[PDB]
């Protein structure tokens, strides 16, 4: 190959061996390595592995401090020239202008790629994972000291880019659609009257479209820094993961709201009309590929207060019972039928964090932090590559937005949902169940008739849009 600089003056020139790095059995996939090797493969010169830059920078805070990583990036960027050969010295010794046959190759195959990928890591680090520099104001200063050090007309355009990004990130996305958004669909409730909004007054579609926009927005705000450390379960959940916990707590609100609407409707004829309205909404969630909503209506019909309502489910038309059995099969058998649906759709999506949270958490517990081979402790990069495949599977769904019109009046009604009221989690769950024992008492007690509650008609406009 080529004569890399001496391993004494340059740490990263040390040759690969089973005591440094382990490759998984055309780009090699590294199973483990010492830190020095990981930054060597992060900015390797032979091949381009732009996943590695994203996999390393997401998960490296377990094994390398942010301050220590940047010290390795400086040491990688400053590559010393290899010692000249004897003939090259003879020109150098006598003052003759040396041909530099090997140095000319070295600067084009080793320095130029490696110095260029180091700035790629530096700009990728600043642009995406900027929270490292905000927390540590000393790190940003060392970052800007390094950028000023970069010299040459080559790579003088890039240090303009990193600097532009830093000044943009320090002080802190218009979307273009090929198609016009479909027009808002209205029902008994008329636009602008927030006081008359409810489950039956609003059109089934527009409940489902505004919930999809509301839930998509909460899904697109979840950054990988709130998942990679298994941090949402730690005692700093509200500081580390405010975006993720706002989406979980929204999904819980709708599920209890769907429970509350079903069991609080005393009259059987009304209640059947409500349960059918919710299933019509669950049907639009499947059209919009809003799988979070599908599993927050399915989770309401499988809840203990609502599952037992066997009288109100017999009166549902068999068409809408076919939807609920189809929608409930997504969650059966460890989400096997839902995982196959998530990978065979044209995504605008709202996937379900239920299964990305239980995979990130079990991947971090199961696999060992370090691999010990030949008596040396290598960082288990296979553990942190599996984790970054999940946080990299979240992001391939966050990119594409929805082509739906945001209705400010409805979207405010769903952000301000308080099904619990002032009650606590256990009291409400009991309050819903006991109210379910009141409206359909357990056998053999009779089913008592109850007064009608809603004044407006209960005919459902249907999942079909008006166009």
């Amino acid at each position: 190959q080529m004569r890399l600089p001496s391993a004494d003056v340059y740490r990263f020139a040390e040759p690969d061996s089973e005591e440094n790095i382990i490759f998984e059995e055309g780009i090699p996939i590294i199973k483990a390595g010492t830190v020095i090797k990981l930054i060597e493969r992060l900015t390797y010169h032979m091949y381009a592995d732009p996943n590695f830059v994203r996999t390393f920078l997401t998960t490296y805070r377990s094994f390398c401090k942010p301050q220590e990583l940047l010290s390795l990036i400086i040491e990688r960027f400053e590559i010393p020239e290899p010692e000249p050969t004897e003939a090259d010295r003879i020109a150098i010794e006598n003052g003759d202008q040396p041909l530099s046959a090997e140095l000319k190759r070295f600067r084009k195959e080793y320095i130029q790629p490696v110095q260029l990928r180091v700035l790629n890591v530096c700009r990728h680090w600043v642009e995406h994972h900027f929270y490292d520099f905000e927390r540590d104001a000393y790190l940003l200063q060392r970052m800007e000291e390094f950028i000023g050090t970069v010299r040459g007309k080559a790579m003088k355009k890039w240090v303009e880019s990193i600097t532009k990004i830093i000044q943009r990130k320090k002080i802190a996305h218009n979307i273009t659609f090929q198609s016009s958004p479909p027009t808002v669909e209205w029902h008994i409730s008329r636009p602008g009257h927030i006081e008359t909004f409810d489950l039956l007054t609003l059109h089934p579609i527009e409940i489902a479209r505004q919930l999809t926009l509301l839930e998509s927005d909460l899904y697109r705000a979840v950054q990988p820094s709130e998942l990679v450390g298994s941090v949402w379960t730690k005692e700093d959940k509200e500081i580390n993961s405010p975006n993720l916990l706002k989406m979980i707590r929204h999904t819980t609100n709708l599920t209890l709201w769907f429970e509350k609407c079903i069991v609080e409707t005393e009259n059987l004829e009304e209640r059947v009309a409500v349960v059918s309205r919710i299933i019509e909404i669950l049907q639009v969630f499947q059209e919009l590929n809003n799988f979070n909503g599908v599993l927050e209506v399915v989770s309401a019909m499988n809840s203990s207060p609502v599952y037992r309502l066997d009288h109100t489910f017999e009166q549902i038309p068999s068409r809408q019972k076919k939807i609920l059995e189809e929608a409930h099969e997504l969650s059966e058998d460890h989400y096997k039928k839902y995982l196959a649906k998530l990978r065979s759709i044209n995504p605008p999506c709202v996937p379900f964090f239920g299964i990305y949270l239980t995979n990130i958490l079990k991947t971090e517990e199961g696999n060992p932090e370090v691999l010990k081979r030949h008596g040396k402790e290598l960082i288990n990069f296979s553990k942190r590559r599996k984790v970054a495949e999940i946080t990299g599977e979240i992001q391939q769904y966050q990119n594409q937005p929805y082509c739906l019109r945001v209705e400010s009046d409805i979207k405010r009604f769903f952000e301000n949902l308080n099904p619990m009221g002032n009650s606590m989690e256990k009291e409400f769950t009991d309050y819903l169940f006991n109210k379910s024992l009141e409206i359909e008492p357990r056998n053999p007690k009779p089913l008592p008739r109850f007064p009608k509650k809603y004044s407006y008609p209960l005919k459902s406009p249907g999942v079909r849009p008006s166009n």
Binding site: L361, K362, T363, E365, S382
Partner: protein, 168 residues
């Protein structure tokens, strides 16, 4: 080959994911992949009869509080896991048992109280108190340690035996 559906139930700080893993990772801890089907499904021989365990462990989804009813409905037997360290997790077992009871709608549900992280010191819960609680419920009690894999097999096997007994 009967397939028993087991569900691990507990709080988020009692380390139940470690319990499921230690059941599955019996040989080596070099590798673990929760996505593939072999991670939550294990074929085991119990009392001379072969059977299959399909364990629904939902660690990390503890904040999805409304979806607990849907998860516990799938399984036939349940583990109620409480950390010996956390005295708070001990009074939380009652609610998990009550919820399991009203989901399956039956007064007697195949269940096994499990005490996790038993090996570490600062045992805020005594063995006698947990044994008394299990006697009150009528369910077995098992002490398991997530680190040393001590008693995990006992816990899952005793749950399987309770599932079999409730069937007959």
């Amino acid at each position: 080959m009967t397939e028993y559906k087991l569900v691990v139930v507990g709080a988020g700080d009692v380390g139940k994911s470690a319990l499921t893993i230690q059941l599955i990772q019996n040989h080596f801890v070099d590798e673990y992949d929760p996505t593939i089907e072999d991670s939550y499904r294990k074929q085991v021989v119990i009392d001379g009869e072969t059977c299959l365990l399909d364990i629904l462990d939902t660690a990390g989804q503890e904040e999805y509080s409304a979806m607990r009813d849907q998860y516990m409905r799938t399984g036939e037997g349940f583990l109620c896991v409480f950390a010996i360290n956390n005295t708070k997790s001990f009074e939380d077992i009652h609610h998990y048992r009550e919820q399991i009871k009203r989901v399956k709608d039956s007064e007697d549900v195949p269940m096994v109280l499990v005490g996790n992280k038993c090996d570490l010191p600062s045992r805020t819960v005594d063995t006698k108190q947990a044994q008394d609680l299990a006697r009150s419920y009528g369910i077995p009690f098992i002490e398991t340690s997530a680190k040393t894999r001590q008693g995990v097999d006992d816990a899952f096997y005793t749950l399987v035996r309770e599932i079999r007994k409730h069937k007959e």
